[PDB]
Amino acid sequence: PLPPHIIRFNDMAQHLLKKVIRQADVLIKENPQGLEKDIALNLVKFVKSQPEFKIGDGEWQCIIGKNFGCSLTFDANVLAFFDLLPSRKSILLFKSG
C-alpha cells in the first residue's frame, strides 16, 4: 500500500507516480530539516538516474512550496502535482516543453 497522499493533478501512468511517492516519502523523512533546495536536488538526481523516465523533450524540473501559483509549458506526457499529508508540502514535477 502506498503512503497516504492527495493527487491534485497527475498525467503520467500510475507506476511512474508510485515510484515518485515511495522515494519522496522516504527522502522527506531522511532530510527532516534544512531547506527545500536539498529536497529538489536529491529528488532530481535520483529521478534523473533510472533507465526508466527515458523520454524527455526538455529536461527535469522539481518545485516545492507551501504557497505559490504557476503557469507551465510542460511536455504533454509527464506532469505531477500532489501533497504529503504529515507535512503538507505541495510538490510539482515535470519535463520542460
Partner: protein
C-alpha cells in the same frame, strides 16, 4: 504514635520513620512494613515478657510465693490475642491506602518504561519539528509539576514515608530525557 511519648529502651519506636524508595522500581517502604510491625511486636514482646515475668506481691522472688499464671491468662485474654487482629488489620488498611497512592502513581511510574533510549530513538527517527520538541519539553515540564505535586504525605497509621526520596527519583529520570534531547540539539548549535 506521635501523641504519646517514649522512654529509653523504646527509642526506636515512637512516631516511627521508615525509608521510602523504589524497591525494584516499585514504591515501597525500605524496611518491610511487616518487619516494622514485627518491630512493634518486638516492642510489645519486650514489654509483654517483662510484664509476664513480674515480681508482684503474690509472685515475690521468682514467683516462689505464688505462681505467675494470671499473666499468661492475660496474655491469652482479649486485650492481647484479639487485639493483635485489630492491629494487623489496621496495618493492612494502611498498606491498602498506600496501594491506593501507588495505583494513582502508577501513571507517574511511566517514566521507568519511557527511559529506554529506544522510545526516544523511535520518536527521533521521525525527524520532528522544533515545535514538536517544544511540546515534549512542555510534557516533561508538566510531569515535573506532578513531581512537585507530592502533596500526599499522610502518615500511614503510625508510620512516616520519605516522600523526598521519591521526589528525587522522579526528578532524575526526568532529566534523562532532557539530556537525550540536549545532545542532538547541541550538535546542531555547534555546527551552525
Amino acid at each position: 504514635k506521635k501523641i504519646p511519648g517514649a522512654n529509653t529502651l523504646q527509642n526506636l519506636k515512637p512516631f516511627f520513620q521508615v525509608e521510602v524508595q523504589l524497591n525494584g522500581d516499585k514504591v515501597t517502604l525500605n524496611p518491610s512494613l511487616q518487619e516494622i510491625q514485627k518491630s512493634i511486636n518486638r516492642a510489645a514482646t519486650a514489654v509483654l515478657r517483662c510484664s509476664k515475668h513480674l515480681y508482684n506481691w503474690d509472685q515475690q522472688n521468682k514467683d516462689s510465693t505464688d505462681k505467675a499464671t494470671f499473666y499468661d491468662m492475660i496474655a491469652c485474654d482479649k486485650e492481647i490475642v484479639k487485639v493483635i487482629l485489630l492491629l494487623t488489620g489496621s496495618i493492612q488498611g494502611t498498606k491498602n491506602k498506600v496501594n491506593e497512592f501507588l495505583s494513582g502513581f502508577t501513571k507517574f511510574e511511566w517514566l521507568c518504561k519511557e527511559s529506554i533510549q529506544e522510545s526516544i530513538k523511535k520518536f527521533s527517527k521521525n525527524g520532528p519539528t522544533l515545535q514538536n520538541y517544544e511540546d515534549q519539553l512542555k510534557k516533561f515540564s508538566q510531569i515535573e509539576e506532578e513531581i512537585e505535586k507530592i502533596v500526599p504525605t499522610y502518615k500511614i497509621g503510625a508510620m512516616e514515608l520519605m516522600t523526598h526520596n521519591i521526589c528525587t527519583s522522579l526528578s532524575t529520570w526526568a532529566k534523562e530525557w532532557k539530556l537525550q534531547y540536549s545532545q542532538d540539539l547541541h550538535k546542531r548549535a555547534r555546527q551552525l
